[PDB]
From a paper:
Biogenesis involves the de novo synthesis of a Fe/S cluster on the scaffold protein ISCU, trafficking of the cluster via transient association to various targeting factors, and finally cluster insertion into specific recipient apoproteins. A critical initial step in Fe/S cluster synthesis is the supply of sulfur by the [name] [name]. Here, we report crystal and solution structures of human [name] in association with [name]-[name], ISCU, FDX2, and FXN, together forming the ‘core ISC complex’. We show that eukaryote-specific [name] binds to [name] distal from the desulfurase active site and does not directly participate in catalysis.
Somewhat unexpectedly, the [name] [name] co-purified with [name]-[name]. In the (NIA)2 complex, some segments of [name] are disordered. This includes the C-terminal segment, the Cys-loop, and two loops adjacent to the disordered C-terminal segment on the opposite monomer (spheres and Supplementary Fig. 1d). As a result of this structural disorder, the dimer assumes a ‘non-standard’ conformation through a ~ 20° rotation of its monomers towards each other along the direction perpendicular to the long axis of the dimer with the pivot point near Pro71NFS1 at the N-terminus of helix α1. This joins the tips of helices α4 from both monomers providing new stabilizing contacts within the [name] dimer. In the absence of the ISCU scaffold, the C-terminal segment of [name] is partially disordered and creates increased flexibility of the residues involved in the ‘standard’ dimer interface leading to a rearrangement of the dimer. [name] [name] binds solely to [name]. The contacts are mostly through hydrophilic and charged side-chains (salt bridges), including the hydrogen-bonded Tyr13ISD11 of the LYR motif. A major contribution to binding comes from the [name]’s Ser36-linked phosphopantetheine and its attached fatty acyl chain that flipped out of the pocket in [name] and entered the hydrophobic tunnel of [name] described above. The electron density allowed us to place a fatty acyl chain with 12 carbon atoms.
Author numbering:
A (entry chain B): 3 to 77
B (entry chain A): 65 to 84, 97 to 274, 295 to 359, 404 to 431
C (entry chain C): 3 to 73
């Protein structure tokens, strides 16, 4: 499993990181995409499902971090 | 008509942009990604430089392969400029090519199509989607006609892949053209789908595959998003000026392409990454155009 | 105002300035969930550029806890 405070810290982390996108469209798409995604899947009740969506969330957080860091490499 | 690179796809290609086996595995992954988006087999996907190359392989490919038996090809008058250039070349080589007009609705007339088929037709090539005004062509019905008539059916989906659902066998596709940078992937990459009976730099092919996977995962969300912003644009102009009209059959619009007329016409493009601020800008900068 | 915090929370939870009291809990008075929480505590530094940590923020359920933490 992955509790509840885990996914709350996760969501906080993707918001925080996505706010560091240098490009405007990428950052608004990122925070709108994340907000809509978590809010839509808020009342999911299946564990094998939930851990799948937080697995995907982690992957995506991986890519977001990599490309905001790359974007900061050139400034 | 290009799109920005999706940071996820860039994340996919970057490992392959930094070092130059793993190539075969990356390419096989990419081609099953494409196939899974369009409902094909992985064996039926071939990578190209883009939809221009795909269209030339399909159209000049079938045209020249069957020259000894068939001489007539059918296309539409509003295809991509390079499709029309290719067909002009085929005409100079001796082929006869029917250029079908599209009605005011923006859709081709099926009766005109099947009336045009001759004993020596090898190929029908019809855009999946009217890029100019924003309608979907009746691809499935055309595939039915061509199947009954024993005609090769090719379609240019460069502007359709990822925006509307596509399935090769349902629509009876024989050949399909796909472009990478029309779906937030990289320029220089494309695909052709060739139906089977029973060269290209790998960073670009894994880019195309990544773009295809992202599209397959994002189709519904982007659909109702682009739809939301389109309704904001149209309704916001209509409120400040009630004389404007939206062209094209309303029952067959697809998200991303809006054509409005004044009393001339202007075309708007809404896609993934388009913000409400941009829609709110070009709604007034166009309204400022008080002719 | 000087402690104009009710503007940020009112703008984040979509409540008028009349409903945002001082003894208002975000979850049971302003009607919020745990995603609106992280969004609002994230939006406070949009006004003050602070850094309220993960550990010391779970108990800022009241609006006056927000004005008191800022102060
Ligand atoms: P609150 O009510 O206390 O919230 C706690 C909740 C209710 C959320 C929790 O207790 C719960 O029940 N969760 C159920 C399932 C869940 O929360 N899953 C979380 C994962 S959701 C997800 O998959 C997010 C996907 C985000 C993709 C964004 C893509 C960004 C693109 C970047 C490139 C530009
Ligand atoms: C852009 C486009 C093409 C060309 O695609 P490339 O990958 O740039 O070669 C072909 N057909 C249509 C309908 C297009 O919009």
């Amino acid at each position: 499993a992955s509790s509840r405070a885990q996914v709350l810290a996760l969501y906080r982390a993707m918001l925080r990181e996505s706010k560091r996108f240098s490009a405007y469209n990428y950052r608004t798409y990122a925070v709108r995409r994340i907000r809509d995604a978590f809010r839509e899947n808020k009342n999911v009740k299946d564990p094998v499902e939930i851990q799948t969506l937080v697995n995907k969330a982690k992957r995506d957080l991986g890519v977001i971090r990599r490309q905001v860091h790359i974007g900061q490499l050139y400034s | 008509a290009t799109t920005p690179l999706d940071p996820r796809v860039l994340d996919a290609m970057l490992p392959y942009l930094i070092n130059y086996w793993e190539s075969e595995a990356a390419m096989e992954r990419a081609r099953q990604q494409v196939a899974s988006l369009i409902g094909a087999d992985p064996r039926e996907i071939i990578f190209t430089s883009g939809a221009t190359e795909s269209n030339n392989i399909a159209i000049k490919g079938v045209a020249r392969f069957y020259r000894s038996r068939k001489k007539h090809l059918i296309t539409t008058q509003t295809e991509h400029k390079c499709v029309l250039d290719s067909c002009r070349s085929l005409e100079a080589e001796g082929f006869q090519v029917t250029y079908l007009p599209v009605q005011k609705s923006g859709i081709i007339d099926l009766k005109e199509l099947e009336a045009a088929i001759q004993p020596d037709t090898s190929l029908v090539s019809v855009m999946t989607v009217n890029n100019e005004i924003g309608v979907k062509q009746p691809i499935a019905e055309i595939g039915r006609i061509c199947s009954s008539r024993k005609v090769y059916f090719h379609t240019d989906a460069a502007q359709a892949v990822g925006k509307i659902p596509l399935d090769v066998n349902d629509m009876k596709i024989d050949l399909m053209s796909i472009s990478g940078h029309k779906i937030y992937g990289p320029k220089g990459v494309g695909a052709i789908y060739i139906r089977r009976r029973p060269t290209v730099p790998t960073p670009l092919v894994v880019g195309l595959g990544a773009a295809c996977e992202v599209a397959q995962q994002e189709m519904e969300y982007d659909h109702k998003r682009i739809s939301k912003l389109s309704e904001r644009l149209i309704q916001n102009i209509m409120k400040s000026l009630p004389d404007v009209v939206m062209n094209g059959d309303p029952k067959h619009h697809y998200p991303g392409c809006i054509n409005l007329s004044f009393a001339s016409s202007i075309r708007f493009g809404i896609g993934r990454f388009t913000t409400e601020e941009e829609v709110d800008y070009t709604v007034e900068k166009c309204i400022q155009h008080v002719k | 105002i000087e402690e104009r915090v009710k503007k940020i929370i009112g703008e984040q939870l979509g409540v008028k300035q009349e409903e945002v009291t001082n003894n208002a809990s975000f979850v049971e008075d302003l009607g919020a969930d745990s995603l609106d929480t992280v969004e609002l505590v994230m939006a406070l530094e949009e006004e003050f550029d602070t850094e309220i940590p993960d550990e010391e923020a779970e108990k800022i359920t009241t609006v006056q806890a927000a004005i008191d933490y800022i102060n």
